[PDB]
């Protein structure tokens, strides 16, 4: 008893996209076959359902209009075309065998990401040194790498000379579509005066390779 | 369009980007965009021999 | 019509955990139960309410009691880490998912976030743009939540967090960012970023410099 899903669709705003479950292992036309999906970090969200037999479709009313079910029963696969798409719709799309309304068995999911975003180097800015643990005597000095597209990219210290106390935060996804990331190193207070400190930012898909200098200044 | 270079060589911004372009003129526009973006406030020369721009702090 | 769970439950090895699930519809419909590890497809735990599939541990049960159903895993393991699901339906017309659980059986002491605050730097603030830059690590269990403030006034515009992230040593991690425009950024005295964990909250404020 499997569900097979389609590959990972890439789509602009405005567009639409179709993807496809095919059923194994059991009478395709038996049960009720329901699409849900899933935003990154973001909970279960149902879109509706298709009964396999004979057509019939129930839509949650927030895609009424938007979203169409179908199947063809003589390769036992269904279909859900969106459309209009928005960056919002972009989510792992599974499909999920019905049982009785609940769901016993579900495909592995099909991404659709949805992006008006094209290639941009970052721009990268200082985080400026401030007091991490005073108890410890550190602080903490990092880069925001800032307003690039696509993931990823890949950030050192000191050319590879500073390694200790490293934490590069994964990215965020801004509502422009580009991504911004931070990493900071924590550092002796003390060594603010004395050692310099330089990220060395890479984002191959621009050919953007900078190293900014973070001093212990604010103007 | 072919490839010209960035030389960022800032205070404290240092390094390299690319940008495809019909001319030089255009590619010193988005470079100008990109050292702009990045509060990069500089001296600008081109080098024709390697069609690489230079931004420079000092 | 919406099915509410908590955030977050946290239990230690060996105890009970109960994940609770409320909506004005649960009377006379059916309660589902999902489990859901990262990287995979939900998988059913319980459903119509109590009734346990038949290859899942039974130290997973369910019960209902009116508006509220719960699930409850006895002797809860490592393995049972995970988000949980419940969902239903409204007329039983459409199905309705609450907003997830997560569950962490605790496997280290609870600790809350170190979170540093760094202001705009003077170079962004010359290409006409702000940002602040709130970094939270170190906290365990692995959710937060994230207020800014403008002065002493809540802004909800221009917030982007990300999601809470595992670290190398079983701790997590997350980071919020804040746009302003340089305008907005010195005419505040402050801003602050506020962040929440296990019903305790860290606050860090930073302020502009006026630069001669």
């Known amino acids: 008893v499997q569900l097979v899903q389609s590959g990972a669709e890439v789509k602009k705003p405005g567009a639409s996209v179709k993807v496809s479950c095919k059923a194994s292992?059991?009478?395709?036309?038996?049960?009720?076959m329901h699409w849900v999906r899933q935003a990154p970090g973001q909970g279960l969200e149902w879109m509706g359902w298709?009964?396999?037999?004979?057509?019939?479709?129930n839509y949650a009313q927030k895609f009424q209009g938007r979203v169409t079910m179908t199947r063809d029963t003589s390769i036992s696969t269904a279909y859900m075309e969106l459309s209009r798409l928005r960056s919002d719709d972009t989510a792992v799309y599974y499909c999920?065998?019905?049982?009785?309304?609940?769901?016993?068995?579900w495909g592995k999911g099909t991404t659709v990401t949805v992006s008006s975003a094209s290639t941009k180097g970052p721009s990268v800015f200082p985080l400026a040194p401030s007091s991490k643990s005073t108890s410890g005597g550190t602080a903490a000095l990092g880069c925001l790498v800032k307003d690039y597209f696509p993931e990823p990219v890949t950030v050192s210290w000191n050319s590879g000379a500073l390694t200790s106390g490293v934490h590069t935060f994964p990215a965020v996804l801004q509502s422009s579509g580009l991504y911004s990331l931070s990493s900071v190193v924590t550092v002796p207070s003390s060594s603010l005066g004395t050692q310099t400190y330089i990220c060395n930012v890479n984002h191959k898909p621009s050919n953007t390779k900078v190293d900014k200098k973070v001093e212990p200044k604010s103007c | 369009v072919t490839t010209y270079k960035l030389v960022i060589n800032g205070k404290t911004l240092k390094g390299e980007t690319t940008t495809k372009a019909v001319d030089a003129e255009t590619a010193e526009k988005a470079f100008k965009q990109y050292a702009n973006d990045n509060g990069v406030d500089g001296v600008w020369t081109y080098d024709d021999a390697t069609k690489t721009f230079t931004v420079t702090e000092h | 019509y919406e099915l509410t769970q908590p955030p977050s439950v946290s239990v230690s090895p060996g105890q009970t955990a109960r994940i609770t699930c409320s909506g004005d519809?649960?009377?006379?419909?059916?309660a589902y139960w999902y489990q859901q590890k990262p990287g995979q497809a939900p998988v059913l735990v319980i459903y119509?309410?109590?009734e346990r599939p038949s290859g899942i541990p039974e130290r997973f049960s369910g019960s209902s009691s009116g508006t509220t159903v719960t699930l409850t895993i006895s002797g809860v393991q490592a393995e049972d880490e995970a988000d949980y699901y419940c969902?239903?339906?409204?007329?039983?017309?459409?199905?309705?998912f609450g907003g997830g659980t997560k569950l962490t059986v605790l496997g280290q002491p609870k600790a809350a976030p170190s979170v540093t605050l760094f202001p705009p730097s003077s170079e962004e603030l010359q290409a006409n743009k702000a940002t602040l830059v709130c970094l939270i690590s170190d906290f365990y269990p692995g959710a937060v939540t994230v207020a800014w403030k403008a002065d002493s006034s809540p802004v909800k515009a221009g917030v982007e967090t990300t999601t809470p992230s595992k670290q190398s040593n079983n701790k997590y991690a997350a980071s919020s960012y804040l746009s302003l425009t340089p305008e907005q950024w010195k005419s505040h005295r402050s801003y602050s970023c506020q962040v929440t964990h296990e019903g305790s909250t860290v606050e860090k404020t930073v302020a502009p410099t006026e630069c001669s």
């Open positions: 119509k309410d109590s």
């Open positions: 969902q239903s339906a409204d007329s039983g017309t459409y199905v309705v």
């Open positions: 519809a649960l009377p006379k419909q059916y």
């Open positions: 999920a065998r019905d049982r009785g309304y609940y769901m016993d068995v």
């Open positions: 292992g059991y009478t395709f036309t038996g049960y009720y």
């Open positions: 298709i009964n396999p037999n004979s057509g019939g479709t």
